[PDB]
Amino acid sequence: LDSFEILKALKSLDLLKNAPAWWWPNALKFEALLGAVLTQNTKFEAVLKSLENLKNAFILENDDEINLKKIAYIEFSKLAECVRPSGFYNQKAKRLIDLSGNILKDFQSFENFKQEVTREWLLDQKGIGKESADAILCYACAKEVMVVDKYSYLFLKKLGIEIEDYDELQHFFEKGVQENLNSALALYENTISLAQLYARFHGKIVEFSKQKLEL
Numbered sequence: 180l181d182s183f184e185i186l187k188a189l190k191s192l193d194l195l196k197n198a199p200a201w202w203w204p205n206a207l208k209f210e211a212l213l214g215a216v217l218t219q220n221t222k223f224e225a226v227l228k229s230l231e232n233l234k235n236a237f238i239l240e241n242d243d244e245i246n247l248k249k250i251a252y253i254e255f256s257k258l259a260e261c262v263r264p265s266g267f268y269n270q271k272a273k274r275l276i277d278l279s280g281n282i283l284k285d286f287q288s289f290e291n292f293k294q295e296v297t298r299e300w301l302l303d304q305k306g307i308g309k310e311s312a313d314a315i316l317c318y319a320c321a322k323e324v325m326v327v328d329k330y331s332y333l334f335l336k337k338l339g340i341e342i343e344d345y346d347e348l349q350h351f352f353e354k355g356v357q358e359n360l361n362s363a364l365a366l367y368e369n370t371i372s373l374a375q376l377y378a379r380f381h382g383k384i385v386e387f388s389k390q391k392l393e394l
């Protein structure tokens with residue numbers, strides 16, 4: 180039992196039949212970063228509502244560099260109101276404003292941020308935990324990082340492997356793929372990157388978990 184065996188078994192279920200290519204809607208865009216922060220301690224359906232609020236208020240429009248600056252400089256109390264649906268909205272608004280201001284300060288642009296950001300930089304941003312930091316790296320920045328979470332902990336535990344520490348659980352999931360890299364990629368025909376693979380693999384675990392299925 181390794182993560183490559185799990186990948187194959189998950190892949191055979193076609194859990195992503197209706198999902199976009201990177202699973203996370205609007206992957207590789209500022210919106211994915213916003214979602215990665217907002218989804219902490221809540222359900223993604225609520226995240227989608229907060230995003231729609233930001234879009235309906237024209238805070239988030241089609242230019243990501245403009246959107247980054249909009250969040251860096253938005254009045255705190257206005258952002259807090261818009262992100263109410265995803266909960267912890269005062270904390271999350273501050274987290275997003277400080278994060279966006281710090282991205283501009285250290286990376287000048289969202290484009291450069293995607294290239295230069297590290298996990299440690301993200302972890303030094305107050306309120307950003309490993310899961311959110313990792314989701315930004317993989318789903319906003321196309322980095323070769325697999326997000327793990329409570330779902331993945333419980334999913335694996337059920338299969339007979341218990342890994343409580345976030346980083347060790349992530350390493351279990353990443354390593355099975357690394358160790359069988361050609362075979363993993365060949366499940367798709369060399370049409371996708373490893374980052375995209377982890378993007379989808381974490382997606383499969385989430386969908387499998389949400390669906391209450393049996394491997």
Ligand SMILES: Cn1cnc2c(N)nc[n+](C)c21
Pocket residue numbers: 202203204218222223385
């Ligand atoms: C975090 N995240 C991103 N895309 C998601 C989805 N489709 N369903 C559930 N979650 C948690 C998601």
